[PDB]
Amino acid sequence: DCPSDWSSYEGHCYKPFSEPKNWADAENFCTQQHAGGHLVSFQSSEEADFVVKLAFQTFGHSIFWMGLSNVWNQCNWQWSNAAMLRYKAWAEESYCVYFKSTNNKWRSRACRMMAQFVCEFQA
Amino acid sequence: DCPSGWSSYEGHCYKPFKLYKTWDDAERFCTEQAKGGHLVSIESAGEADFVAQLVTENIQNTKSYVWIGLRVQGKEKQCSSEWSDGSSVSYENWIEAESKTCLGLEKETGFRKWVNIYCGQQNPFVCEA
Amino acid sequence: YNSGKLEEFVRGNLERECKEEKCSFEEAREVFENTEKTTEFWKQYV
């Protein structure tokens, strides 16, 4: 059974937070909220639906960090003319994933930016 | 030397187009504008500066984004493969437009920085040969 | 336009973000929440 301030769903515990934090600070904060804590991860649509609803029910319309970071840094970025990728001029260094509390769609945001978030751990 | 309408910079020829095409269409279009043509490849700060100047002088609308040739060559929506809790990323639910695996130049950053944007967006661009 | 603070916590608004301010394709999309509608908008916006 989850802590009084958390919500239970299929054997896991979830809790949304309103403190604006960047991705890294949010993830770190989650590890400190309970043993095995992390930013929420969606292993299925059912789980995602539960979390989105919880977030909206608690704080209304806002954006919430999910547990995915540096999502394109390992991708195979290549120049169409096959030129070697040496020089770099990225406007943003890293992107992270979040959801807007009105639906369960995955969205991207620079990891350095702020957002609310949802923590999760296995009960 | 470069054809009329094209501009020369360190051995290559560049040309901006005020045509709005998706990344794929723009890239294909560029391969037909000159032998060996492609969306521009920014390989140095100087080239980045040369292209920035070319864009400012030819692409009026400062609201537009300008395609460059660097993009994720693969089908992945993300390449992390793992959540912060250590579990694998299987289920996904991206809005395709949120998987910004293409890059464009824009006014706010002086057309010198690469901004992650949706590949299906129709934007003006620069070809290089 | 994105000031870079907490403005994206609130619902999108075409007038505020695209008319009174310059907006990116994505900001418009966060308003319509339909990529095609945003593409139609984009054609007439530029």
Ligand SMILES: [Ca+2]
């Ligand atoms: Ca989970």
Ligand SMILES: [Ca+2]
């Ligand atoms: Ca080049």
Ligand SMILES: [Ca+2]
């Ligand atoms: Ca704004």
Ligand SMILES: [Ca+2]
């Ligand atoms: Ca905005």
Ligand SMILES: [Ca+2]
């Ligand atoms: Ca917005």
Ligand SMILES: [Ca+2]
């Ligand atoms: Ca304003």
Ligand SMILES: [Ca+2]
């Ligand atoms: Ca936004």
Ligand SMILES: [Mg+2]
């Ligand atoms: Mg107004």
Ligand SMILES: [Mg+2]
């Ligand atoms: Mg968005």
Ligand SMILES: [Mg+2]
């Ligand atoms: Mg249409």
